[PDB]
């Protein structure tokens, strides 16, 4: 009686009456997403209906982790949780979970090819890095940052969409099979910043092996010390790839592409787009970089931080909804 149903494609969305005018806005493997107006809050929201949450243990563990993390992370530069509900009345009937989140206006896909100025560019990046820093402080390393999972509003505010784990934006540590740390996410910020500037994808590798080629062509074969850190097998390949000296950052990003600021933009990129993670700039040091630091505000850029049966997962998820 508190619920009503709307058909969205092949999907039936049964939601609380407060949510009105549902229309689909996209999908992932993790379910269909509708935009809706929350009458009670008087604002637009995203409603995500979870795809087969306890179909199996892999799905169940994913749904559970997503839910718990969403309840613990809270920051203006990360998509927040507004509500969680199920239309089923008991554990035995329990089938569906709905997640109500903040709605923005677009993802970055389009925004980044519409050339921006230094103020808007640096400000968006600043917001990205605050969101990232906050994720890291909650012990979350994203690893899959890309323009499709970064959303913006027409007032120039920006939010990271999800908690991550197109191959174009993944760090060398991930591409190859290395370990990783916090600044893995900085590689992605470099690729996105890079795109915004040159108008197109920095490393548009047509597969995982081509992806590598794209990088060394433009940045230059990494040092022999880096080469060591690799496995037996992949090191063989990487080390047997033809030496490239790569191009300087002046050639990779000339003045022609920019509207002193151009000079700093380039300097930041040269510190972000560095194959060897042990020499790549960090998140803190990037928030402090001259190009980004103009916007600083410690309330934004500093804010304080096993195995089950399907039947058990169902119970834990149901309790997390209640």
């Amino acid at each position: 009686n508190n619920f009503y149903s709307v058909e969205i494609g092949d999907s039936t969305f049964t939601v609380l009456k407060r949510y009105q005018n549902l229309k689909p806005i996209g999908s992932g493997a993790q379910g269909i997403v509708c935009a809706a107006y929350d009458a009670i809050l008087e604002r637009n929201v995203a409603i995500k209906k979870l795809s087969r949450p306890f179909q199996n243990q892999t799905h169940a563990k994913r749904a559970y982790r997503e839910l718990v993390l969403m309840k613990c992370v809270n920051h203006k530069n990360i998509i927040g949780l507004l509500n969680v509900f199920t239309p089923q009345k008991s554990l035995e009937e329990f089938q569906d979970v709905y997640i109500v989140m903040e709605l923005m206006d677009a993802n970055l896909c389009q925004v980044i090819q519409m050339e921006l100025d230094h103020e808007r560019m640096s400000y968006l990046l600043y917001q990205m890095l605050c969101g990232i820093k906050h994720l890291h402080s909650a012990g979350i390393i994203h690893r899959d940052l890309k323009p499709s999972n970064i959303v913006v509003k027409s007032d120039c505010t920006l939010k990271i969409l999800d908690f991550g784990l197109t191959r174009y934006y993944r760090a060398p540590e991930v591409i190859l099979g290395m370990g990783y740390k916090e600044n893995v996410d900085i590689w992605s910020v470099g690729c996105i910043m890079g795109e915004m500037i040159k108008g197109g994808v920095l490393f548009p590798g047509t597969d995982h092996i081509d992806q590598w080629n794209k990088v060394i062509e433009q940045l230059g074969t990494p040092c022999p010390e880096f080469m060591k850190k690799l496995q037996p097998t992949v090191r063989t390949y990487v080390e047997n790839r033809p030496k490239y000296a790569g191009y300087s950052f002046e050639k990779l990003f000339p003045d022609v592409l920019f509207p002193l600021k151009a000079s700093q933009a380039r300097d930041l990129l040269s510190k972000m787009l560095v194959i060897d993670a042990s020499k790549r700039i960090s998140v803190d040091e990037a928030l402090q970089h001259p190009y980004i630091n103009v916007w600083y505000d410690p309330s934004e850029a500093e804010a304080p931080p096993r195995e089950h049966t399907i039947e058990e997962w169902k119970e834990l998820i149901y309790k997390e909804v209640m």
């Binding site: 389009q110 913006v152 007032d155 916007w295």
Partner: peptide, 9 residues
């Protein structure tokens, strides 16, 4: 500088 309040969609 003032923070941008507009972004062309």
């Amino acid at each position: 500088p003032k923070r941008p309040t507009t972004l062309n969609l």
